[PDB]
Design an enzyme around this catalytic site. Structure first.
Site, PDB file in Angstrom:
ATOM      1  N   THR A 135      44.905  49.369  46.540  1.00 36.27           N
ATOM      2  CA  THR A 135      43.603  50.141  46.587  1.00 36.27           C
ATOM      3  C   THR A 135      42.576  50.229  45.426  1.00 36.27           C
ATOM      4  O   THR A 135      42.921  50.494  44.282  1.00 36.27           O
ATOM      5  CB  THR A 135      44.000  51.558  46.960  1.00 36.27           C
ATOM      6  OG1 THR A 135      44.765  51.435  48.146  1.00 36.27           O
ATOM      7  CG2 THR A 135      42.813  52.464  47.277  1.00 36.27           C
TER       8      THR A 135
HETATM    9  C1  04C Z   1      46.223  49.662  47.262  1.00 31.83           C
HETATM   10  C2  04C Z   1      46.525  48.543  48.318  1.00 31.83           C
HETATM   11  C3  04C Z   1      47.431  49.537  46.314  1.00 31.83           C
HETATM   12  O1  04C Z   1      47.649  50.808  45.695  1.00 31.83           O
HETATM   13  C4  04C Z   1      46.164  51.132  47.943  1.00 31.83           C
HETATM   14  O2  04C Z   1      46.724  52.122  47.065  1.00 31.83           O
HETATM   15  C5  04C Z   1      46.819  51.330  49.330  1.00 31.83           C
HETATM   16  C6  04C Z   1      46.372  52.715  49.793  1.00 31.83           C
HETATM   17  C7  04C Z   1      46.411  52.903  51.195  1.00 31.83           C
HETATM   18  C8  04C Z   1      46.952  52.004  52.127  1.00 31.83           C
HETATM   19  C9  04C Z   1      46.948  52.296  53.490  1.00 31.83           C
HETATM   20  C10 04C Z   1      46.406  53.493  53.947  1.00 31.83           C
HETATM   21  C11 04C Z   1      45.868  54.391  53.031  1.00 31.83           C
HETATM   22  C12 04C Z   1      45.874  54.100  51.669  1.00 31.83           C
HETATM   23  N1  04C Z   1      48.289  51.326  49.266  1.00 31.83           N
HETATM   24  C13 04C Z   1      49.052  50.447  49.948  1.00 31.83           C
HETATM   25  O3  04C Z   1      48.615  49.526  50.639  1.00 31.83           O
HETATM   26  C14 04C Z   1      50.565  50.637  49.789  1.00 31.83           C
HETATM   27  C15 04C Z   1      50.990  49.947  48.516  1.00 31.83           C
HETATM   28  C16 04C Z   1      51.975  50.719  47.879  1.00 31.83           C
HETATM   29  C17 04C Z   1      53.301  50.619  48.299  1.00 31.83           C
HETATM   30  C18 04C Z   1      54.298  51.359  47.669  1.00 31.83           C
HETATM   31  C19 04C Z   1      53.985  52.212  46.610  1.00 31.83           C
HETATM   32  O4  04C Z   1      54.959  52.939  45.978  1.00 31.83           O
HETATM   33  C20 04C Z   1      55.772  53.752  46.840  1.00 31.83           C
HETATM   34  C21 04C Z   1      52.662  52.306  46.179  1.00 31.83           C
HETATM   35  C22 04C Z   1      51.662  51.562  46.808  1.00 31.83           C
HETATM   36  N2  04C Z   1      51.236  49.979  50.931  1.00 31.83           N
HETATM   37  C23 04C Z   1      52.222  50.551  51.653  1.00 31.83           C
HETATM   38  O5  04C Z   1      52.664  51.686  51.461  1.00 31.83           O
HETATM   39  C24 04C Z   1      52.791  49.672  52.782  1.00 31.83           C
HETATM   40  C25 04C Z   1      52.267  50.150  54.143  1.00 31.83           C
HETATM   41  N3  04C Z   1      54.266  49.727  52.780  1.00 31.83           N
HETATM   42  C26 04C Z   1      55.011  48.980  51.942  1.00 31.83           C
HETATM   43  O6  04C Z   1      54.541  48.213  51.101  1.00 31.83           O
HETATM   44  C27 04C Z   1      56.538  49.161  52.064  1.00 31.83           C
HETATM   45  N4  04C Z   1      56.910  49.945  50.888  1.00 31.83           N
HETATM   46  C28 04C Z   1      57.251  51.315  51.325  1.00 31.83           C
HETATM   47  C29 04C Z   1      57.502  52.211  50.158  1.00 31.83           C
HETATM   48  O7  04C Z   1      58.556  51.580  49.374  1.00 31.83           O
HETATM   49  C30 04C Z   1      58.253  50.220  48.948  1.00 31.83           C
HETATM   50  C31 04C Z   1      58.044  49.347  50.146  1.00 31.83           C
END
Ligand code: 04C
Ligand code: 04C
Ligand code: 04C
Ligand code: 04C
Ligand code: MG
Ligand code: MG
Ligand code: MG
Ligand code: MG
Ligand code: MG
EC number: 3.4.25.1
Lengths: 222, 196, 222, 204, 232, 212, 195, 195, 196
Positions: free
Chosen positions: B1
């Site tokens: 993000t």
């Molecule tokens: C950008 C991409 C990176 O920080 C944004 O913060 C974004 C915010 C967002 C996304 C969708 C809806 C609303 C807001 N965050 C993500 O895309 C996020 C990346 C992320 C993963 C894990 C984190 O630490 C726990 C921090 C940031 N993506 C996800 O959560 C995706 C859907 N799931 C995964 O990657 C699986 N994860 C689950 C948590 O454990 C690690 C594996």
């Protein structure tokens, strides 16, 4: 797994392959990954096989009780809310990756849920090991204002991409069409492009080949 | 993000990209990271999608219940509820939230809530992985009491750079305008913002 | 940390007849859950009526085959164009493999051909050079699936003469080239059904006194 | 210290023409040490048969548990439980221990007394139902069994022929596994008669 | 033992009736930072071969120098250096494959995935892959990184086996490659819009195209998507 | 593996199983675990299979070079020590070898040496080596006497491997018998456990733990 | 703890259990009885983790004795073994499991048959003609496979047992200070004082 | 390997060394001699890592025998012990050190005195009236502190040694299968066959 | 560190802060990170002080020896020598170097050499920990063929922001101007640049 969901004119369609794996071994060559939550709300599941089945039945059970309590047909957002709060509570340990779709009084809907409890909205979605192969096809051929027949074709094509190119997916294509104002039609084994060829030989053994030590009648009656 | 919220003369505007990543794979290229917790109180979500989602839903529930009993809550009140959840569950959460809302008394307000769960009231706020690349730009270009069109350009140019350098950011630029007039949703496509 | 090994999947199979020998192998090549090639041969004619395959990590497999082919070439130069017998080839391969005992070639190797009496011969190796002549051997990913079937159908294991009270064993006899190819085709189709790393195509190399012939058959591509 | 391969063992099930077969080996060991050559892994509750591979304490425990449950079922329902229903009961009971599971690989087999249809099913340790027309395999030589069944099997085999196929599938698979073998038992199940045969196999 | 620092993403390719096509974007990533944007990851060798490289860029630049030096060395005492004894694609590949496997065997690999595309002297299409492990394979379509997961499925719909190659024209083949590059831009977080494409034909020869862009993108449907579930 | 060899009135008996393992996977049932070094020397193999096969074959080459240089067959002591010094150089590198050098010479008489990959070298009358050594010891020790006949000694060796083949999950296949005398080694056949077990059970009346 | 053996013959069950109790580099005792009488015709030997062994044995003993008083009746060996198995089956999934292996030798007065049950700490029960726990089995099982016959007398069983102890004393690394032997038959439980 | 003892008395040095060779759960041999004659009036016992022990002992033996032939003269026990210590002192800082502990019992013909040297694998040398390596010392040292006198005879030394072996057989966990005893005096080295 | 090098009409200018840190302690607040490897070839050093120092000294030695035999080396040549050292010793080095020089034929040139040891010829380059915060600003504000005064302002404003946000950057802003005229050293103190 490879699973997809595609929105069209008057509803939504979901599809899935029918392979189940344990390591590099195919455990089930024709398993059912399309799950009924309510009559017109269906769920495609990828991930830990038991988790997708258990979580879909539990929410499906509670949705039925809710429908009876409220005297209303269940909504997709209710299934979505119950599934995501359940999955979040278990911090990803329930390894269910779901594509939730269906029709209800509000309209037609298509969502996805991840094991940790995050939900997405979209016109076309794909989950599982072959989601990249499927998404490649969806990104290439999807367009706005699809017809029913076009959406089924696109959905099955996306699953086929997983079947052929992903080692975690194979066998057949299951489909479920959920159209507004009509009954949902579950198309079990809509395509079967992996029929086993005739074997070269019959391995029927001559009777008496196996050596036996004892015989006995087993009592199954009272 | 990459996300941000910016106060201006008539109120406040929230901004965000639309990229959701699972590693280097883009799980969703058209994500809506700007979420409604009340009529004119919205938030930008960064960090764990699941965590920020669960929090936002709880806050929305709290503020709906607040409204039933005590009428419209202040933006500060909304930020306090976010803080309470983020601070008390800091060990189990990965959530960087920006809270932005419009009162008629207080006008536009922005509160940022980083990982720790601290609260910081600011004129404007930036957050998410892509925000690092635009600290320099945003500090040099931000002015207080900007117009709507100036603030929209400020956010568009800022997020455009954040998207350009951050691989974890991309897609469309969504914006939500909060004023006395009401709520306005804006979208901006790559073909426009990329060549700024 | 850098991991110098990989797994390229696939499976191989060698059967020996009275005056012939076959060495079969599927043509699929993989890494993780992706298909690299649907037709990448790994059974090679090495000269002097010796066919060879080294299945497992393809880089090590190719390196070994390359070194053995080269060993055959220098054997001719150093010993007046003398034919390298299958038993001599086997011993040479042991030294190639054991030379890297403490940084092994990650492959299960099989060679086939005719012995010095003109009879069919199959030799098989572990990764570090231990070898043994047999009538029958499967190697690679699906070895665990195919091998017990071969024990039953080639060496007639656990099969007794009907009506002899499990006292007289089914007598051992050589199989015709027609019968052997039937077993090879059925072995691979069965392995393809239940193992994700096996499929796409089957290539068989048959070795008689007349030379080395080839046969190709399609396998399921999911 | 891998629970599923301490004691060892295998189970296989097959369908035929108006009949089903279920078979198992007799070994119980402690890793390399063979301890018992009488440890049967197939049980039955009424006309429904259940085979269980894996950790031997859990094999015993689950048998005792399903006897308990099928007995209460019969008292309240006033009829014997059917294979399709029993399959669901096994699945529920395994998933109940989702985060502290029984380390087992169960296999249901039997003929529905109402419809007369042959039925077989398999499970993972956590409850996932694996239904099949042809065959189900389980245990430390599951890979071996998969290879044998997938080649040897053909549909609509007569009870006498089906016995030969399932027996050869088990025997040759067990002989390629160190932790399986040491004797074997085969059940042939028809609509209203059940024959149990002990097989002669190599004892190493 | 290495870790890759500045990296390049997917390289994709396929065969068609008269030759081969290969493509790769112009990005040099520094982790999540999209650091360098003018990076050429397709490197021609002579007028009959193009080497496409992904992975570590410092190691890519080293390989560039090796290929550059190979052309020089081949010209030495060689009157037929621009004729019968010119460098073939098969020679160039086997050289790199040898180097890649030697380096992995010394536990000091070149952290790359390489595709050598070209046309042999007898007209035959050449397309083969090699990587940091020294693993090699050939196929009608080949791709590295995310390309393997997303491009190959699309390119295999055009050329699914050997017999589909004579039936595939350069117009159809290039269209599939350009489409695949768009899909990768949608879905790969370490990809860029700008890319290079190369065609090696047995008749028209080497055509190297620079500064291409992904276009005809579908983003309009994004405006309808509100919230993550219950937002109106 | 289970391998044994014991000294007695009528020379040396050597008996081995024929199973090869890769974890719980049975890799082979027909492996030769006795190597015939020369007409008067035998070597048993236990542990890593390439290690045993390679180095005991190499071993035979060294002994051939000895008799070419010295115009005399190598002693059992010198033979076993060449191997023990070889594996000692590799100590720590991870070789896995449990070996028994059995043979006859004029100066020594019938002699058995235990040599392992740790560098341990021991002269002795009875040894059992391998994963199933304890099972073999149990039967062998409880029936052993110096005054056994050639016929009884051959059977005890056969029966001891069978015992281990049965109980040890990593032993089996078949029994290979040898008898070493002043005139050299004599092969006494391959005995499949598939038939041998039931033959022994019936005739001897033993193995009452098994369902007959 | 370490060596516990069991042999079922025609009319009795014989249990042999080592006398040594070692901790560190010191043999603290050489006359330890590793057994408890659960009922007049049922005896349980035990081996495993220090403390756990006796604590478990006496706990079972108390429960069986309680049952006997309540019903004025002796539980069958099969019934006692099933009770013991279930207790161990509970134990293995507890916070701190009992690390105890047991042999249960008993004479069923209703069937007029001796019965030997081998149960490990996981709750793995088997009825056997002869049994052992720990490293002992690696020697004794093959030995008994050869020398055991089902129709043997108690005296023949003791000679068969002497053959096991001799082998263990020859090939086992540790000095286990001999064994205490006990016989279970129709007349109850008695100890052999000279072994 | 395991138990090696040494006692220096008025006119001789007595070395006692265990006969067991164990690997895993099997005693492979019960008649092993854990000693080498370095010279006619010098004996070295050894214990430690398998393979290393014999390889080291024979290597020293060869060197001392080589010296004897070259000079036509026997090195003093003090001189041999210093040579042995230095070899171990080199070894400990090698790529793979010899993990061997030794006792050197010798009779110095020039001084007409018995001498006992205890040297561990680090190259730690001490001259002692009595010595031991491994866990043995935890019992024997205190025992000898009480019962040892400097003016004892060889026969008194053997009885004193019997007292050590008895204590070890009573309290040691492992069965070491008795000891081989050897005496070093003015007349050379001889083995006691009945101990 | 925050460092940069920028080509312009008359040649090239190198820029750097003056902060050296050992953890959060500032070991030297007046550091000179701009170092001479030849008359009109200089470099900016980021990463390990010891590593970059040892490298720069070796390069200076190589170019002095080059000059003795073959005359003045090109800026590309200098960058190649840096690359060779950084690439071949990548496992043991932590050095991010920007090479900048003035030829009369080639005018101003800038080569950047990141951790891996790759070479990248660019119009301008930024590097060090503080550079992350000014990617957005520098991309929006850089123009080709700037004047001396414009380039000085560009660098001053850029490093000012990098210093403001990066704790690992600070002190004075040093600059070195490379043109046909010669070599000019510039310094700028906090009291000036902080309030930009
Ligand atoms: C950008 C991409 C990176 O920080 C944004 O913060 C974004 C915010 C967002 C996304 C969708 C809806 C609303 C807001 N965050 C993500 O895309 C996020 C990346 C992320 C993963 C894990 C984190 O630490 C726990 C921090 C940031 N993506 C996800 O959560 C995706 C859907 N799931 C995964 O990657 C699986 N994860 C689950 C948590 O454990 C690690 C594996
Ligand atoms: C594809 C095949 C994944 O390869 C699908 O996701 C598929 C989904 C599915 C859904 C409903 C019915 C059948 C199949 N998933 C599987 O087949 C799944 C693969 C998998 C194995 C292990 C996992 O966690 C480590 C996650 C996914 N297979 C299973 O769940 C099988 C039946 N069970 C096991 O392998 C045992 N599990 C129990 C849970 O803990 C891990 C091991
Ligand atoms: C019994 C079966 C217990 O293993 C015997 O020791 C048997 C002896 C034997 C001797 C000659 C020929 C065949 C068999 N040993 C084996 O079968 C042996 C067991 C073993 C495996 C690995 C070891 O690690 C050093 C030690 C012992 N099996 C093998 O050697 C198998 C066939 N090959 C491999 O495991 C290949 N490995 C060897 C070690 O290096 C990596 C590859
Ligand atoms: C900023 C401060 C951070 O990157 C600059 O890069 C600066 C550059 C510089 C400093 C002085 C002279 C010329 C250029 N770098 C430092 O100040 C540097 C910080 C650093 C330390 C270690 C690194 O990885 C090896 C990378 C950057 N400071 C130092 O090197 C100081 C003098 N020494 C230490 O901090 C002690 N180090 C030695 C190396 O091992 C870790 C402990
Ligand atoms: Mg969380
Ligand atoms: Mg981006
Ligand atoms: Mg397949
Ligand atoms: Mg077996
Ligand atoms: Mg066995």
């Amino acid at each position: 797994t490879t699973i997809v969901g595609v929105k069209f004119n008057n509803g939504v369609v979901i599809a899935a392959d029918t392979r189940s794996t344990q390591g590099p071994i195919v455990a089930d060559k024709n398993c059912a990954k399309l799950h009924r939550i309510s009559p017109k709300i269906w769920c495609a599941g990828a991930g830990t096989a038991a988790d997708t089945e258990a979580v879909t039945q539990l929410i499906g059970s509670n949705i039925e009780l809710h429908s009876l309590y409220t005297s209303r047909e269940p909504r997709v957002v209710s299934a979505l809310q119950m599934l995501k709060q359940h999955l979040f509570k278990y911090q990803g340990h329930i390894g269910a990756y779901l594509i939730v779709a269906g029709v209800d009084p509000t309209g037609s809907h298509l969502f996805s849920i991840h094991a940790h409890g995050s939900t997405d909205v979209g016109y076309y979605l794909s989950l599982g090991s072959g989601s990249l192969a499927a998404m490649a096809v969806l990104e290439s051929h999807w367009k706005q204002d699809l017809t029913k027949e076009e959406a089924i074709k696109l959905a099955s094509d996306a699953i086929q991409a997983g079947i052929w190119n992903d080692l975690g997916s194979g066998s057949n294509v299951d489909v479920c069409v959920m159209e507004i104002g009509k009954d949902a039609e579950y198309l079990r084994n809509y395509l079967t492009p992996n029929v086993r060829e005739e074997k070269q030989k019959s391995y029927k053994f001559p009777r008496g080949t196996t050596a036996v030590l004892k015989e006995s009648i087993v009592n199954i009656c009272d | 993000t990459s996300i941000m919220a910016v106060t201006f003369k008539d109120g406040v505007i929230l901004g965000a990209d639309s990229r959701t990543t699972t590693g280097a794979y883009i799980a969703n290229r058209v994500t809506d990271k700007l979420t409604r917790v009340h009529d004119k109180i919205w938030c930008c979500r960064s960090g764990s999608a699941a965590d920020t989602q669960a929090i936002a839903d709880i806050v929305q529930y709290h503020l709906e219940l607040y409204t039933s009993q005590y009428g419209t809550p202040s933006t500060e009140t909304a930020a306090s509820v976010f803080k309470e959840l983020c601070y008390e569950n800091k060990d189990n959460l990965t959530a960087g939230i920006i809270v932005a809302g419009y009162d008629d008394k207080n006008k536009g307000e922005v509160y940022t809530i980083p990982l720790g769960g601290s609260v910081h009231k600011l004129p404007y706020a930036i957050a998410g992985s892509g925000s690092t690349f635009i600290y320099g730009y945003c500090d040099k270009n931000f002015r207080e009491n900007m117009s709507k069109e100036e603030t929209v350009d400020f956010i568009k140019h800022s997020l455009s750079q954040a998207i350009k350098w951050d691989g974890s950011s991309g897609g469309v630029i969504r914006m939500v305008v909060l004023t006395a007039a009401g709520v306005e949703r804006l979208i901006f496509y790559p073909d426009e913002y990329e060549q700024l | 940390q850098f991991n110098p090994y990989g797994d390229n999947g696939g499976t191989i199979l060698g059967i020996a007849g009275e005056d012939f020998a076959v060495l079969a192998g599927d043509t699929r090549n993989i890494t993780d859950y992706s298909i690299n090639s649907r037709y990448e041969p790994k059974v090679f004619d090495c000269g002097d009526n010796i066919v060879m395959s080294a299945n497992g990590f393809a880089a090590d497999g190719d390196a070994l085959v390359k070194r053995f082919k080269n060993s055959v070439k220098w054997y001719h130069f150093d010993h007046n164009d003398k034919k390298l017998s299958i038993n001599s080839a086997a011993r040479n391969i042991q030294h190639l493999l054991y030379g890297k005992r403490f940084f092994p070639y990650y492959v299960h190797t099989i060679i086939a051909g005719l012995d010095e009496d003109g009879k069919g011969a199959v030799y098989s190796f572990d990764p570090v050079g231990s070898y043994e002549r047999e009538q029958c051997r499967a190697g690679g990913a699906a070895a665990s699936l195919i091998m017990p079937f071969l024990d039953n159908q080639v060496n007639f294991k656990n099969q007794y003469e009907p009506g002899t009270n499990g006292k007289v064993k089914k007598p051992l006899k050589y199989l015709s080239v027609e019968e052997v190819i039937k077993l090879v085709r059925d072995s691979f189709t069965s392995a393809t059904e239940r193992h994700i790393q096996v499929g796409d195509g089957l290539e068989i190399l048959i070795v008689t006194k007349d030379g080395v012939r080839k046969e190709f058959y399609e396998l399921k591509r999911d | 210290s891998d629970p599923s391969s301490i004691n060892g063992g295998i189970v296989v099930a097959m369908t035929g023409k108006d009949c089903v077969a279920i078979a198992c080996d007799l070994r119980l060991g402690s890793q390399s040490l063979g301890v018992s050559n009488k440890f049967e892994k197939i049980f039955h509750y009424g006309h429904v048969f259940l085979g269980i591979t894996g950790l031997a304490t859990d094999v015993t425990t689950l048998n005792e548990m399903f006897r308990y449950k099928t007995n209460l079922y019969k008292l309240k329902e006033e009829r014997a439980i059917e294979p399709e229903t029993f399959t669901q009961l096994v699945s529920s009971s395994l998933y109940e221990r989702r985060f502290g599971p029984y380390f087992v690989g169960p296999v249901v087999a039997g003929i529905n007394s109402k419809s007369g249809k042959p039925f077989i099913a398999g499970f993972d340790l956590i409850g996932c139902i694996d239904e099949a027309k042809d065959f189900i395999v389980s245990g430390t030589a599951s890979d071996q069994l998969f290879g044998m069944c997938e080649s040897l099997y053909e549909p609509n085999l007569e009870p006498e022929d089906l016995f030969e196929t399932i027996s050869q599938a088990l025997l040759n698979a067990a002989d390629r596994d160190a932790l399986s073998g040491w004797g074997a038992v085969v059940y042939i199940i028809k609509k209203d008669e059940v024959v149990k045969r002990y097989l002669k196999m190599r004892q190493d | 033992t290495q870790q890759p620092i500045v990296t390049g993403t997917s390289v994709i390719s396929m065969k068609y009736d008269n030759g081969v096509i290969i493509a790769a974007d112009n990005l040099g990533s520094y982790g999540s930072l999209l650091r360098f944007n003018g990076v050429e990851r397709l490197i021609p060798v002579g007028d009959n071969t193009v080497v496409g490289i992904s992975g570590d860029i410092s190691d890519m630049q080293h390989i560039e120098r090796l290929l550059k030096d190979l052309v020089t060395e081949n010209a030495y005492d060689n009157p037929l250096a621009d004729a019968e004894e010119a460098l073939e694609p098969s020679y160039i590949f086997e050289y790199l494959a040898t180097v890649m496997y030697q380096r992995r065997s010394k536990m000091n690999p070149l952290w790359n995935a390489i595709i050598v595309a070209g046309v042999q002297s007898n007209g035959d299409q050449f397309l083969r892959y090699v990587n940091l492990l020294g693993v090699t394979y050939s196929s009608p379509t080949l791709a590295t990184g995310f390309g393997a997961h997303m491009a190959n499925p699309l390119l295999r719909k055009v050329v699914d086996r050997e017999s589909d190659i004579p039936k595939t024209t350069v117009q159809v083949a290039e269209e599939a490659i350009v489409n695949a590059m768009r899909v990768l831009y949608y879905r790969d977080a370490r990809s860029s819009r700008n890319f290079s494409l190369a065609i090696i034909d047995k008749n028209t020869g080497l055509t190297f195209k620079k500064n291409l862009q992904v276009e005809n993108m579908k983003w309009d449907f994004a405006k309808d998507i509100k919230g993550y579930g219950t937002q109106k | 593996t289970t391998t044994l060899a014991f000294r007695f009135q009528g020379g040396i008996i050597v008996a081995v199983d024929s199973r090869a393992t890769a974890g719980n996977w049975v890799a082979s049932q027909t492996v030769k675990k006795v190597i015939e070094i020369n007409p008067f020397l035998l070597g048993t193999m236990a542990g890593g299979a390439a290690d045993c096969q390679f180095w005991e074959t190499w071993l035979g080459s060294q002994f051939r070079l000895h008799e070419l240089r010295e115009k005399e067959r190598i002693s059992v002591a010198a033979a076993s020590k060449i191997l023990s010094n070889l594996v000692y150089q590799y100590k720590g590198a991870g070789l896995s070898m449990g070996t028994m050098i059995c043979g006859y010479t004029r100066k020594e008489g019938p002699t058995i040496y235990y040599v392992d990959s740790d560098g341990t070298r021991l002269k002795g009358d009875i040894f059992c080596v391998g994963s199933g050594q304890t099972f073999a010891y149990g039967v062998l020790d409880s029936n052993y006497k110096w005054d056994l006949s050639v016929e009884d000694a051959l059977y005890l060796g056969k029966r001891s491997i069978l015992a281990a083949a049965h109980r040890d999950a990593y032993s089996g296949g078949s029994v290979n018998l040898y008898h070493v005398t002043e005139d050299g080694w004599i092969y006494h056949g391959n005995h499949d456990v598939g038939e041998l077990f039931w033959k022994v059970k019936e005739e001897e009346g033993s193995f009452n733990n098994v369902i007959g | 703890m370490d060596i516990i053996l069991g042999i079922r013959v025609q009319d009795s069950v014989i249990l042999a259990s080592s006398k040594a109790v070692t901790r560190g580099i010191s043999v603290l005792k050489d006359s330890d009885d590793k057994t408890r009488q659960l009922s007049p015709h049922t005896l349980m030997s035990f081996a495993g983790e220090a403390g756990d062994t006796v604590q478990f044995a006496e706990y079972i003993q108390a429960n069986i004795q309680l049952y006997s008083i309540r019903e004025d009746y002796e539980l069958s060996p099969q019934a006692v073994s099933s009770f013991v198995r279930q207790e161990l089956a509970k134990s293995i999934r507890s916070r701190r499991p009992y690390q105890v292996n047991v042999l249960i030798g008993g004479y069923d007065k209703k069937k007029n048959k001796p019965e030997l049950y081998q149960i490990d700490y996981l709750g793995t029960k088997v009825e056997l003609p002869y049994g052992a726990h720990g490293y002992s089995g690696f020697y004794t099982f093959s030995l008994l496979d050869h020398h055991y016959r089902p129709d043997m007398t108690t005296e023949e069983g003791l000679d068969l047992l002497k053959l096991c102890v001799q082998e263990l004393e020859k090939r086992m690394p540790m000095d286990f200070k001999g064994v205490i032997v006990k016989i279970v038959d129709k007349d109850g439980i008695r100890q052999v004082d000279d072994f």
